[model samples]
Target chain A: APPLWRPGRVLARLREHQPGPVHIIDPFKVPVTEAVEKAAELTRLGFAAVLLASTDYESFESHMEPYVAAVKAATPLPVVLHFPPRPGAGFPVVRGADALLLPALLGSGDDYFVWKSFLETLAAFPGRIPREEWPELLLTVALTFGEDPRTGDLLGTVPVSTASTEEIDRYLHVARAFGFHMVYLYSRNEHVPPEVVRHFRKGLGPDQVLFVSGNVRSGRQVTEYLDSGADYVGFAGALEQPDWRSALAEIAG
Target chain B: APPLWRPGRVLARLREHQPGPVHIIDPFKVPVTEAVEKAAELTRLGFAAVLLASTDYESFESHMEPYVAAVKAATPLPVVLHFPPRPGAGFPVVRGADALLLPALLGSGDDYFVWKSFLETLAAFPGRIPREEWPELLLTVALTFGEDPRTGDLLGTVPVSTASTEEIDRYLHVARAFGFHMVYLYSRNEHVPPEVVRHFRKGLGPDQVLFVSGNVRSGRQVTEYLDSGADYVGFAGALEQPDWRSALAEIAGR
Candidate 1:
């Protein structure tokens, strides 16, 4: 059996996981039983974790409550939930998830709305796990999509591929002011440049964890980004390969 | 000496005080001892509360910690602190402040900055009295002055006397979402008209308290605004009168 995952521990050891930074983003939908079996399979194959996100915001709590329980039942791998910061964002405060990633869009040309919506969600938080509001939260700068990745609804915003240095700094400063110790810099089609990652890592310092993800197939590509400055790199694109497990194993190797 | 004060009790009993709605804004810069004595006098005069505000933002903590201790030492009148929401607004959280009035300036042409600064201060709060993030907090909608009242500084912002009804509702909505149970509609010279007060009261509902302050004289005027849906009216301008306590007494009189 794999070890139990806890808050802060996921980010801290994300890169150090023996199988490399082999975090999974659920792109495929199968039966809950099949999903549970696959999670068990991924755990057996030494994959580090899986990201559980929802297509339905209104029924997210109900959808995730049981899905998270069943996944955790099958595997001890960490479950990172991507919580949407939309209106009526009364967070579910689910029981088994290891950490929550709140995406505060940077350089989205709507900073006031972005930050305010973030604060509104945060203000309503009942201060559940993550203890002092820092431990379990990874302030996701943004991923490259206005549309919902799972649902594909045009969310009335455009993709922010390369947020300015000043903009990223301000977002991180706001994050630091509120006790966030982790940041995830993600892009899907256009990879977050290694130069940007290096610059942000300098700003983040040794204490804070910086995680980066982009479209990449080769294991060497993940190692190269990891070596640049990022403490952790998410190989989410590995699942796109014909031999997905083999691709993940190459990166883990 | 009057009775002891606690969080939420101030807003709850503010309108119910025997002396009408006479709450004092400390306009005099007397010594600590005299200020303490004046608090005792105000308590004797049936005044509901005293607002302690400081001109200095940087050193407000050191200035207020002792001042609050001395005033609470001498009198039992509830002390409300006007905490400024500037860059370094880590709240003082003084031992005896019965309530805190955070002025989130509406119609300041800077709604984002105003709300953000308010949230910044609140985010840094250690969650002292006024338990559950509400109770003793009175969300003060602008008081019609650009400069700091204690020191004239032309604070790069204009007086937002009458914020639009939509703006007021939005501010109040944000306040309610965060558990605030009190609102202070204030103006200095140009009064927060009775019509606006009546309009806001409908939105605040009966459970929330609405306290209004503006330029007013005679005792009847105090009762007049209160009649217009203001739960409590601040008789701050009476300090400018020759016999302030006498002016205060008339309002308190049946």
Candidate 2:
């Protein structure tokens, strides 16, 4: 069992470093050498925090560690590591990161089994797993709610399909039950209707945070999701355009 | 609330005309003038019933009544009038037809309200809605699970989204509660995963009939849905491909 990352220090750090709503940086999009530069630029652009996602975990030891260290040193912005909840992946790779972003841990099949096993390992880690052993990491899960467009990538987080309203409630219930205070909803390319976000909010508690990402191109897009119940929104492809600064300011305002 | 369609004669007629697994004719696709000829061809091709659908129901009295009469006169095959469960539709238009195919009736919205109102009128028809006044007509509701690709068509049914497993279960439960023994599920151009049908079956009694339509292209496709709990599968598109007879033969295994 992997150790439960202590939450108190992590939450304190989040309040201290990243107040207000947060935005994520897809770590895969930024190279390790440019991590510090990107973090500085995003914080200057008004992003509250920088989420570091490693596209592949097998190479996390060589690739992700240095980047986390560099970003942590370069900027006061909260650095959260995005992890796929899988065997031998999330627990060890989450070191040096202020928070762990786990995506795709709920399902009926093998995915469920892996999550259970990981939890069990953490529980059975021989007495109280020492705080020193695992860092105080803010735990967040990216909630996927339909067919994943990414093909043949089992390592990626698997989202529960919202084809049924029951499925939606169950995902929300299970994420909160697993001690995750924050959950994210995102689409790769398609525009997610505001109704989808509004319906999702009905299942959430007021204190729980819902982050919407992908397909957010403008300030109105950000405000629409936020008004519809998303507490935060992320920009990836849209940020590449020069006008993203104003868009970020509009969202921040 | 709308009066429940009297099921006695309807059930008896269904037992007689559509004894085996049934197939439906998209009444909108076949012209009214060709009603008799198409019914004859479908019966020859082994369809159990002919469903007469008026693409526009506001004009249904003029357009579909003659077609239903002609088909009924032309063949002993059951002639079913497809009614839209809309305002000012269903009950009145269902007259003179041997069977009624009313789709999109069960919902929590205005559609449900209209259905309830229509049934109420039938229940309170002049002289206490005599069962004998309306002869036994086989009744079926085509269930739509998602968006219908055909634009502006009222004859086609719309189903609730099955993204929620509960939604699928509720639809089955409501249909059965409303005395519908047979229901059809159809998509316009996409494939419905077998799990959707399988989950729906969990909500139904073994005796209830489930008809699957669209995306059925081959014998293997037919067997796949059947294996996954579909009672019957429709083949409007596949039947048009010229190899339909053999394809049907392949599924029948004769």
Candidate 3:
């Protein structure tokens, strides 16, 4: 319950687990038995990991390969495979690490050819395993707030609109000169406050670099966004409750 | 500027007496020449309307039939139609009354087959217009906001929940109990606040209902959401600013 930050290496394999925020329900224009009874009612209210990807985009993988194993055997949990990060999908390679390389994508305002044909359909189905079989992915870089700078293929310079701390230090030093591993300061309807994610983790430096803090609403504002360093936190609107595993053990006590 | 409630009559005919908060930009996964020059740079920034809908929901007139004359030559403002109530199209009969219905047919958990095919596609499309063109078509029921039942679907009584103020008062009390003349609350990545859209306009009576508070970061929260009770507000983030027409003259200085 105490490991709030510095737990790196993917928060020490997600802090001996507390995963109850599995929201896989975007079948776009609904109906797949209501997207598999919304993944068997969030695996009967206890989601310790469930993200069966392929969101409605041109009915990918034919509505995601027939309910990905009946929503992974009706919430028998631990189901990840949410890809994104196109553009000749070369890096973030991983496999047989029992799935997890989540890199979601969403685009529009015409940079067309379906965002380079969804990055050339993930670099022509290169969901292959290598890069020393590194698959334990989760990279959802969602920037769907809204702004159509008449979108000439924008991938960054987002909501970094000027509150002028020199426009937040040049969009966090151009998102650490673009080789980003993590950097999310969200708003799909705002709410950052944990001293604005601890002043952007004292100007973005908690290393291996992760800061996911999007649209969070509770669990004591996700325990003040894991006591303000947020090296892992995108559990929007209180990760579905039914005492969500004892409200995540009272937000990790 | 001071019409917070009762402009109803479909918000006084989709109200755009030019002044703040009303935005729409989905460009259905962008590409038709950057979705019509970002809808002509959000109609030269002062956006109050444009949902000439796109998220490429597979041929809704093949991405809005070639932007119907560049969305009527981009912006005298008022162009809406972004309906994606997917899964073999159920309950969609939009005959352009400047439409804006984005129903996400609530699904999560194990896609209970998108709520039993959204109750079998509204029992084979029998709601809103086509009770045999009932009462001369004028539909407005846009209910969309998913991804907050811990990220998506868990339908009822929680499990990745969002869209429960009793399933948003039974999805706007069953679209004003099967007689929807107004309803629009779509915000992708789920967001609803303006005191829960003033309790869905205190249970639909501010001239029925119209909530298009489609989340866009700032312009002072889109002028504190059209000073709460937005009858008409949709734009792709304060019209992609660069002094968005002086941020729509300071949210129409109200």
Candidate 4:
């Protein structure tokens, strides 16, 4: 008995969108009160979902459980908590949010620690999320797809900015084997050439949902991944600006 | 400008052998006086090369430079210095040995630090190994292929017991791009099943030399890897007891 999420409205900001695939807003340019304001701006401008890095909750140690609730209550966009590669970090998960995105930190002892810690986090706590209503849960694995661009850091198992489809499929197969409902290709930096997401699209199994984002600033970049077979494309870093709103409206094409 | 190492006698103590591919002995089971004794026993057993971990020199700070020369003076086998992955660690290098085996600790920031420190180690020191005879250098990259089986430790970039040929081909290509003369497929543990050596064979370019080792105790084990297209197949620890010489002679397949 799984819950039905309307197609094109999986994150429930609307029965409609800004005329592209669902756009995700992550207010995590930093962790402070500014993120809350940025999220409201994200809600007002209309993104389909909010991606909160589970590590970001370090700023709101006391209100973590309520921070999700407080943020979700203010903005109609569903909150999707993004887990970090570091094992055993704590964060909030209120039931009936959009989903949980658990990314294995590949090659960083990801299989042993990060995945193990997530199991420990999820298995306990009836009040955090009742196991009785586990049917609505959407779990996905995000593999580091490219480089940090500035630092050249990669959580990617492979060291290159872009990798062959064959090299990536092995990790995806592991995700699928673990029964993750979907997969995410997270390019850690924007400068990863727009052409690279194509292999990620090529690597996915037909049954998995694909959500891809890497500093999308223009319709040109957005449509490339969208047309390359991304079900959702995310909008980046709304915190920047003389006219951050001006920038948000610009990616809608 | 170059030192000539005979084809079959690359690690002298040779001119002849116990009749198989060149076998290597690593006396690193422990770092005591026993390692020196083991090297002598290695010489008596007629192995082709001595592999000393650069980190092993930590045991004899005052005598490290002499340790290599002293060991080489007693045994005709060439000494291959195995540089470890830890950057900035100290080790000794002497001129006119078989070759240097500098393995990059992949996924362990090898591209930057390990490779960089090796360049630093080679660049300084006029007495170590003069810059002129550098033509005899036989630098190579050792990528970890499988598990340790006991501790499950790995210097491997990939985190599996065995990887597909195409997956491994990328790292090999990088070594070739960096102009390394050869590559080593080092399975960190014996429990990595024998058939895994086949892909390391399949992945190599025609020009590259392949040195593979993961514990061989029998003639069948040695011949399988020797036939699986390895240029050299290494034998494991001689540090075991009782009838150890019997064990060594057993592997000769006479």
Q: What does DockQ give for each predicted structure?
A: 0.06, 0.01, 0.02, 0.01
Instruction: Report how far off residue A15 is in candidate 3 (Å).
Output: 23
lDDT by residue (B131-187, candidate 4, tens digit) is 454313354656554544321232224433344555455555444433444566665
lDDT by residue for model 2 (A65-154), tens: 677788888887667665555453224444566656544344323432223323322322323334454444444544554456451255
lDDT of 2 at A155: 37
Runs in model 1 lying further than 4 Å from the true structure = A1-253, B1-19, B54-58, B111-113, B127-179, B240-242, B251-254
Candidate 2 runs further than 4 Å off: A1-6, A12-21, A88-94, A107-109, A112-114, A120-133, A137-141, A145-147, A151-164, A176-179, A240-253, B1-254
For candidate 3, what is the DockQ-based docking class?
A: incorrect
Residue-level lDDT tens digits of model 2 in B1-254: 12224345444544444323334445556555555555666666565665554333455557655666777777776666644555332354534566555453343234333133333233223222333333343334455555664422543234557667665665564455334556667666677778887876667755556667766766677778878877666665454444655655554434
Better of 1 and 3 by DockQ: 1
Give each model's whole-structure lDDT.
Answer: 0.57, 0.54, 0.44, 0.50
Fnat per candidate, as a fraction, reads: 0.03, 0.00, 0.00, 0.00
Candidate 1 pairs with clashing backbones = none
What does the interface RMSD come to for each candidate?
11.2, 23.0, 17.2, 20.7
Summarize candidate 3's per-residue lDDT along A1-253 as a digit string, tens digits: 1111113244344434443233534433445564456556566655445544332244454555555555555556555554333433322222322344333222232221212222223322334434333334333223333343422244332444434455445334423322233454544445555665565567764443344544554467666676776655554234343444444444434
The lDDT of model 3 is 0.44
Q: B117, model 1: CA deviation in Å? A: 3.1
TM-score, per-candidate, Cα-based? 0.49, 0.43, 0.25, 0.43
Q: Of models 1 and 4, which has the larger TM-score?
A: 1
Runs in model 4 lying further than 4 Å from the true structure: A1-253, B1-47, B54-63, B89-92, B107-114, B123-136, B149-158, B161-163, B239-242
Query: What is candidate 1's lDDT per residue for B99-200, written digit by digit as tens?
Result: 776665443434323444554444444445333433255545543432234322322235543556644555554444333445666665467778777777
